[PDB]
Amino acid sequence: VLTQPPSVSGSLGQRVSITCSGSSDNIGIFAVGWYQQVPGSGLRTIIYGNTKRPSGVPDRFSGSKSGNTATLTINSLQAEDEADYFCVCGESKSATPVFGGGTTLTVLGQPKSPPSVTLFPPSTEELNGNKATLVCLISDFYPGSVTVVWKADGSTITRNVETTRASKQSNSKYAASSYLSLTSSDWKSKGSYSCEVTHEGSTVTKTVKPSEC
Amino acid sequence: QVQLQESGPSLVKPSQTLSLTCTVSGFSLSSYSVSWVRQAPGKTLEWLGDASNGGIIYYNPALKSRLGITRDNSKSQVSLSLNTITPEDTATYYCAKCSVGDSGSYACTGRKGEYVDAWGQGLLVTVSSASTTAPKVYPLSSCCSSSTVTLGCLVSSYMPEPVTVTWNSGALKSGVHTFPAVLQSSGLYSLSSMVTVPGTQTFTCNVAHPASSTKVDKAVDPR
């Protein structure tokens, strides 16, 4: 697998770049291409063979490669360029193509906004069924990416966490939610749980304590 | 106008066989290779295989024992079957048309040659063992600290989408924020709706689930 940053921001009319990184087994030897996936829509081939644009792709898109890295460069950024961008490369060892994880590009079009976080503990009614679901609701953030970290008594929790992708709100900011699904015994077996939502380096955290609810 | 369209079941049970068909238009199928790619709910792209215009079918070796890909030139269709599925096969499935010419691209087949120049719409297929299931509705409250209490309802464990949520039969609209659903590892969806309000007012969420012909009203106590 190749590595590209999860997200990037740019300004209208100006230049942004997205770099994809691998090893001398893929990017050093073989050609790299770039796909554009526009929100709630399909894939579009932007670049093939390191530098080439298929017919109909505007020339403000360009590709390049140096060493074990490849780069998609977009000049004169337009709103329509907001998309997820994926690199693709050949692999010497394997037979398949390999892909980067995708870089989500935001073209800044409204004020940046931190997320509001509400964390709900499990209900008594749910605890009566011996199940406990903590609900973390995240709203009003812009740009539309956050990362969610769950903690119990200070330790990071990964299992039985389901987090949605961000989705556009009707006021053009973004929302998401995250669910921690436990049994009632698990829930009672910790002193405190926290939902920690980070957005552009700043983390917003909410906490619930079983002893208090 | 070059065009590719995936079709097949959008909901499949584990251990069954996922079968998709790709129907193409605006080009001569027999003249071009067609690849299958899939994208998991949050993850990256995974190449499945290619039905090359020479008659050779290339498979992702990690999935070869589960994959089948065939070509039907006389119907302008390429097909994919995937057996012994598990929830890990939930993904949006794409067929894609390759170029014709020796670039230095590996995107089409596994090997040096053509790139992908046109993408199908993509078909989201959900793998879940669950049949149609009405939701359980649980009240949500922040009773564990400001002066404006936040309430909600957890619409838990239903299938399939969608549900609709209102509060006080639609009389309460400002402050309501209903969120898109999550698909849990149980194979069922859940979503939450939240209301924030600034002393005898009561709050009831009305959850409707058309597929199971169910409507649930749950009173939420703003203690």
Author numbering:
A (entry chain L): 3 to 215
B (entry chain H): 1 to 144, 148 to 201, 206 to 230
Question: Which sentences did the original study use to describe this structure?
Answer:
We have investigated the role of the LC in the structure and activity of two neutralizing cattle antibodies (B4 and B13) that bind the F protein of bovine respiratory syncytial virus (bRSV). The F protein epitopes recognised by mAbs B4 and B13 are conserved in both human (h) and bovine (b) RSV, and are a major cause of lower respiratory tract infections in young children and calves, respectively. Both B4 and B13 are potent neutralizing, fusion-inhibiting antibodies and protect mice against hRSV infection and calves against bRSV infection. B4 recognises antigenic site II (residues 255–275), whereas B13 binds to an epitope contained within antigenic site IV, V, VI (residues 417–438). Exchanging the LCs between the Fab fragments produced hybrid Fabs: B13* (B13 HC/B4 LC) and B4* (B4 HC/B13 LC).
Comparison of the structures of B4 and B13 with their LC exchanged counterparts B4* and B13* showed that paratope of the HC variable domain (VH) of B4 was disrupted on pairing with the B13 LC, consistent with the loss of binding activity. By contrast, swapping the B4 LC for B13 LC leads to large changes in both orientation of the B4 VH domain and conformation of the H3 loop. The VH domain of B4* differs by approximately 10° in orientation relative to the VL domain compared to B4 VH. On exchanging the light chain from B4 to B13, the H3 flips around to include a π-interaction between Tyr100C (Kabat numbering) of B4 HC and Phe31 of the CDR1 of B13 LC. In the B4 Fab structure, this space is occupied by Trp31, which does not allow space for the Tyr100C interaction. In addition, the orientation of the H3 loop changes from the sequence running clockwise when viewed from the top in the B4 structure to anticlockwise in the B4* structure. The area of the interface between the variable domains of the B4* Fab is lower than that for the B4. This analysis shows that amino acids 100E to 100 L of the HC in the B4* structure have very little involvement in the interface except for Gly100 G, which is completely buried. The large conformation change that occurs on replacing the B4LC with B13LC radically alters the conformation of H3 and this disruption of the antigen-binding surface is consistent with the loss of activity. For B4* an accurate Kdapp could not be calculated as the assay had not reached saturation at a Fab concentration of 5 μM which was the maximum B4* concentration used in the assay, but suggests that the affinity would be in the micromolar range.
